[PDB]
Paper text:
The covalent modification of target proteins with ubiquitin or ubiquitin-like modifiers is initiated by E1 activating enzymes, which typically transfer a single modifier onto cognate conjugating enzymes. In the presence of Mg-ATP, E1 catalyzes the acyl-adenylation of ubiquitin, initially forming a ubiquitin-AMP adduct. Subsequently, the E1 catalytic cysteine attacks the ubiquitin-AMP intermediate to form a thioester bond between the cysteine and the C-terminal glycine of ubiquitin, resulting in the formation of a covalent E1~ubiquitin adduct.
As the resolution of the UBA6-ATP complex did not permit a detailed analysis of the interactions between Mg2+-ATP and the protein, in particular the coordination of the two metal cations, which could be visualized in the maps, we determined the structure of yeast Uba1 in complex with Mg2+-ATP at high resolution. These crystals diffracted X-rays also anisotropically, and, after processing with Staraniso, resolutions of 1.72 Å in the best direction and 2.24 Å in the weakest direction were obtained. Refinement resulted in a high-quality model in which the majority of residues, including the bound ATP together with bound metal ions and the surrounding residues, were well defined. Somewhat surprisingly, two octahedrally coordinated magnesium ions instead of one were observed to interact with the triphosphate moiety of the nucleotide. The first Mg-ion, Mg(1), is coordinated by the side chain of D544, one oxygen each of the α, β and γ phosphates and two water molecules, while Mg(2) interacts with the side chain of D472, one oxygen of the β phosphate and four water molecules. Comparing the contribution of the two acidic residues revealed that only D544 is critical for ATP hydrolysis since the D544A variant was almost completely impaired. In the Uba1-ATP complex the side chain of R590 points, to a first approximation, towards the bound ATP while it is reoriented away from the nucleotide binding site in both ubiquitin-bound structures.
Residue numbers in the entry: 10 to 746, 750 to 968, 976 to 1024
């Protein structure tokens, strides 16, 4: 099993961590001490990630209050040992990870069986120090974490010696160079930014004239603006001539950690929130004081909301400040109000805080196992005090926060009973049931959100469960693959908290325009707020627009590998998701794709397009030509690529295969065309020694002169191009004939083919720049030469019943030849242009647009969302109380900012909210009266009334049609069915005679 990773399970996580880090993880034995909510959350993430084994220690009996955040305990478990009852449920998370229970820790030498030891808040500070001393002195990595109500911390001690092998997890930077001067000044090609920072290291390739500079030697970077950097003298290597590519290399970094005992008096802090810098040292003394309080008082924490205990904690912190003078520093007084809240909340057990630290700490465990990413060094403290409701609405005292003998006692401890009841009675829509959705439903189950008679949860997701989902969608099991995500998730969390039984309406509908009959006005209007758990801009933007329309708050969030974000959208207050979006990533120039690739990303895009044309569009165009009597006529109206469409039909029918041998021949001939003849044609038009107008080499920089390929069936890429191409063609034409192709079989067919020789077309123009005109446009064909191709098409009557079967691209079925073809095809073109070839996993990442994902980040971001949710429940209108988050666990880095206020505008002298305000019109008004009323009371000379894309009115004949009739007219005579409201968008002029931006209209039918 050594060295093997199950890519079909770990696919998305492999794109975060890499194979080497996971191989180190699969050798590491982890021990977690304490299996309340914090411990089980950490264990859940580490077991999903795949370590060698997980061992849990917790002999304490389950009590009902433990269920606040321990999602694997049930009321039937009370009195049993937490470790014992949790082991079997953790074991079900990942069959590759054995989960054991450690019965006793009296003998500390047992720790020597483990590589990483995690001490949660069940471990006293006295025991944490003893355990850390044993781990530190033995070479065992040590991590501890504690949560106390809305506060928490983590401590990391990986020993005297630890090597970071990759500090960031980012793709290495690369770039093309146009000069390296004798002093090492490197000039970037054209406008290309290097993207490097001082102190980075690079190696070089293709630098002609400097020979051994390309041998993998590393050079330390001194940046000289964003388009040049310096590497020190290169005189010893020669004299630059031309060419070159730099590649950033991450070098190992040896670091050293101090023990817990040393760090108690002289801590090294990583801050979680730059608005709260000064709180870290205060909380550092406070968390210690809580332990001292417990040793005084028979192991008990301060009493909930108890002011006597709080005053005692403050004195403990004061005394400790004198013993630990370097913590606060000189002249800094104890923040007594802060310590008071810590005392008041010490017993609290809050799902969002547990999820935040569970995700952070589990990732630190994986860093400890692997050397991947930069460990936290060494203390981080956190609070989410902004989550507290306004005491005017929900007073906090010993009466309101007292236990009621329920699983929620330690959330009540913080928020009070009435606030928890308001959570129970909340009405929420969750859009999506994947990674964030599953974690979200778990958090809500622990909150009891929707368990109240007036509350409920709706969750919708049209997708089914797939194997790779299981790595981070922890409510799903191997047996659940193929079932509907939302339905399985709802059932799973109601087992975790039967209080939610019957309160989760699991739907399998896709959210978007086509389901507004389902998600109608009554549906949205009833909601308290909406939570997104989506993975695409279209769905996120659509939900955002509904939330704006219905003025519902929206909780947005996302992850990308180790990075994540949260966004709070509040009606009449903040920007929305849509207005905050970033302009799209610039696309690859078409000439670069078509003729001058220089990165594997370019050859993969090209190969994916060829795949689409060969095996999807070609088949569809045939079927349409055979089925629609007007196809040819339509194809000149619709056009786009008339020449290409008609040629594909003619090719598809004239060269139809009769057996599998015919498909092999076809694929071998396409190999010759794409990787030999077309390349000789390019070189005919642009000889290797050709010059531009200004006498410089045409083939320089981003233009890499290719060499045609001579087919070699022992080259893996040539072989698999033909295998995959033939199999997909055989699929197209319903031919049948092996998962293992036989090289000798294929070789016998190909060996006996006659391969047409290349003859150049000497009258072609190939586009060099995208600014230049397009030689291969419909305008570049001619209205006369298409007739030949049309009349040469066989009439459908000669092909009765003939049908081609189009391929639907599926990146995640490794037996279907899709990624095989794209990888081989890409790599053959990479061979043409001397680009390094890529394996199937990288090709699948790019061609499939897979998003790197891991449960640690998913759980952490979800925790942060639920800390903002508390603020919706209190109807907070102070924008300064909300927190938009950005996280990068690689670093680790945490940043928070208050949301951005909605832009405000003026159609002069009237102030409006450019996002949330609109004109509400009662009734199906006649067009003329609507135009009038804008002049009457809004003083607007309306100039463009549009419904969706079309313009119902434009000043560039005359209508007295009620809007509902007007829309029918211009939308090909369709009848609105369930529509009670209609959104219209206006362009207008103001009383001063000037065009103004104006809010949209709602027609209430
Ligand atoms: N318009 C929509 N309506 C409802 N659910 C949606 C919509 N668009 C996307 N989703 C859901 O959002 C969820 C996003 O979760 P996530 O991306 O973790 O899972 P996934 O897409 O199956 O995994 P992967 O991206 O790794 O294949 C998906 O389950 C997806 O079905
Ligand atoms: Cl390359
Ligand atoms: K020519
Ligand atoms: Mg400098
Ligand atoms: Mg999916
Ligand atoms: Mg997805």
């Amino acid at each position: 099993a050594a060295g093997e990773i199950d890519e079909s399970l770990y696919s998305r996580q492999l794109y975060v961590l890499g194979k080497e880090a996971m191989l180190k993880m699969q050798t590491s034995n982890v021990l977690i001490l304490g299996l309340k909510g914090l411990g089980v959350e950490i264990a859940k993430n580490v077991v999903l990630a795949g370590v060698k084994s997980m061992t849990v220690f917790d002999p304490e009996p389950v009590q009902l209050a433990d269920l606040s955040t321990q999602f694997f305990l049930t009321e039937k478990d009370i009195g049993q040992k937490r470790g014992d009852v949790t082991r079997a449920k953790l074991a079900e998370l990942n069959a590759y990870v054995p989960v054991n229970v450690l019965d006793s820790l009296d003998d500390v030498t047992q720790l020597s069986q483990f590589q990483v030891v995690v001490a949660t808040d069940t471990v006293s500070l006295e025991d944490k120090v003893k355990i850390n001393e044993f781990c530190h002195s033995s070479g065992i990595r040590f991590i501890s974490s504690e949560t106390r109500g809305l506060f928490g911390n983590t401590f990391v001690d990986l020993g005297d010696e630890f090597t970071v092998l990759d500090p960031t997890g980012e793709e290495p930077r690369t770039g093309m160079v146009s000069d390296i001067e004798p002093d090492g000044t490197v000039t970037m090609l054209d406008d290309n930014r290097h993207g490097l920072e001082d102190g980075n290291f690079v190696r070089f390739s293709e630098v002609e004239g400097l020979d051994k500079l390309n041998d993998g030697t590393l050079f330390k970077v001194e940046v000289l603006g964003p388009f040049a950097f310096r590497i020190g003298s290169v005189k010893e290597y020669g004299e630059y001539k031309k060419g070159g590519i730099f590649t950033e290399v991450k070098v190992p970094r040896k670091i050293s950690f101090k023990s817990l005992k040393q760090q108690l008096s002289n801590p090294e802090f990583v801050f979680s929130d730059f608005a709260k810098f000064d709180r870290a040292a205060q909380l550092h003394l406070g968390f210690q004081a809580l332990h001292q309080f417990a040793v005084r008082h028979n192991g008990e924490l301060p009493r909930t909301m108890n002011d006597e205990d709080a005053n005692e904690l403050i004195k403990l912190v004061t005394d400790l400040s004198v013993q630990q003078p370097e913590v606060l520093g000189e002249g800094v007084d104890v923040n007594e109000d802060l310590i008071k809240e810590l005392s008041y909340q010490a017993r609290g057990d809050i799902p969002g805080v547990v999820a935040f630290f569970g995700g952070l700490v589990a990732q630190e465990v994986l860093k400890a196992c692997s050397g991947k990413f930069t460990p936290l060094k060494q203390f981080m403290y956190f609070d989410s005090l902004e989550s507290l409701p306004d005491p005017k609405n929900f007073p906090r005292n010993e009466k309101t926060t007292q236990p009621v003998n329920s699983r929620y006692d330690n959330q009540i401890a913080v928020f009070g009973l009435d606030f928890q009841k308001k959570i129970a009675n909340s009405k929420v829509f969750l859009v999506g049931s994947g990674a964030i959705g599953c974690e979200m439903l778990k958090n809500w189950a622990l909150l009891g959100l929707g368990s109240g008679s007036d509350g409920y949860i709706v969750v919708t997701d049209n997708d089914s469960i797939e194997k790779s989902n299981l790595n981070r969608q922890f409510l799903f099991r191997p047996k659940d693959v193929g079932k509907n995500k939302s339905e399985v998730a709802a059932e799973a969390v109601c087992a975790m908290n039967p209080d939610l039984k019957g309160k989760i309406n699991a739907k399998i509908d896709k959210v978007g325009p086509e389901t507004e009959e389902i998600f109608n006005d009554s549906f949205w209007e009833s909601l308290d707020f909406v939570t997104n758990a989506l993975d695409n801009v279209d769905a996120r933007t659509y939900v955002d627009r509904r939330c704006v329309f219905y003025r519902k708050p929206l909780l947005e969030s996302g992850t990308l590998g180790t990075k994540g974000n949260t966004q709070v959208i509040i009606p009449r207050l903040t920007e929305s998701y849509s207005s905050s979006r970033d302009p799209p990533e610039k696309s690859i120039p078409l000439c670069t794709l078509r003729s001058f690739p220089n990165k594997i990303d370019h050859t993969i895009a090209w190969a994916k397009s060829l795949f689409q044309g060969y095996f999807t569009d070609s088949a569809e165009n045939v079927n349409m030509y055979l089925t629609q009597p007007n196809f040819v006529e339509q194809t000149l109206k619709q056009s786009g690529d008339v020449k290409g469409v008609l040629e594909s039909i003619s090719d598809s029918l004239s060269s139809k295969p009769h057996n599998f041998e015919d498909c092999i021949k076809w694929a071998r001939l396409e190999f010759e065309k794409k990787f030999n003849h077309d390349i000789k044609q390019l070189l005919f038009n642009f000889p290797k020694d050709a010059k531009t107008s200004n006498g410089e080499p045409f083939w320089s920089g981003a233009k890499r002169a290719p060499t045609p390929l001579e087919f070699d069936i022992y080259n893996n890429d040539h072989f698999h191009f033909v295998v995959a191409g033939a199999s997909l063609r055989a699929y197209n034409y319903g031919i049948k004939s092996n998962s293992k192709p036989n090289v000798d079989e294929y070789k016998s067919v190909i060996d006996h083919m006659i391969i047409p020789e290349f003859t150049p077309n000497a009258n072609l123009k190939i586009q060099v720049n995208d600014d230049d005109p397009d030689p291969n446009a419909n305008a570049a064909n001619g209205s006369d030469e298409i007739d030949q191709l049309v009349s040469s098409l066989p009439d459908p009557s000669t092909l009765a019943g003939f049908k081609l079967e189009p391929v639907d691209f599926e990146k995640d079925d490794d037996t279907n030849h899709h990624i095989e073809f794209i990888t081989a095809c890409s790599n053959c073109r990479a061979q043409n242009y001397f680009i390094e070839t890529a394996d199937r996993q990288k090709t699948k990442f790019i061609a499939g647009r897979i998003i790197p994902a891991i449960a640690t980040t998913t759980s952490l971001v979800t925790g942060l969302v639920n800390l903002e949710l508390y603020k919706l429940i209190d109807n907070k209108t102070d924008i300064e109380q909300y927190k938009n988050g950005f996280v990068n666990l690689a670093l680790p880095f945490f940043g928070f900012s208050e949301p951005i206020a909605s832009p405000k505008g003026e159609y002069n002298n009237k102030k409006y909210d450019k996002i949330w305000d609109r004109f509400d019109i009662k009734g199906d008004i006649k067009l003329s009266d609507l135009i009038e009323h804008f002049e009457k009371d809004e003083g607007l000379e309306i100039t463009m009334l549009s419904y969706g894309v079309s313009l119902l009115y434009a000043s560039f004949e005359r209508l007295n049609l009620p809007i509902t009739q007007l829309v029918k007219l211009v939308t090909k005579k369709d009848i609105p069915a369930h529509v009670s409201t209609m959104i219209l968008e206006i362009c207008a002029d103001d009383k001063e005679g000037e065009d103004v931006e104006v809010p949209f209209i709602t027609i209430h039918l």
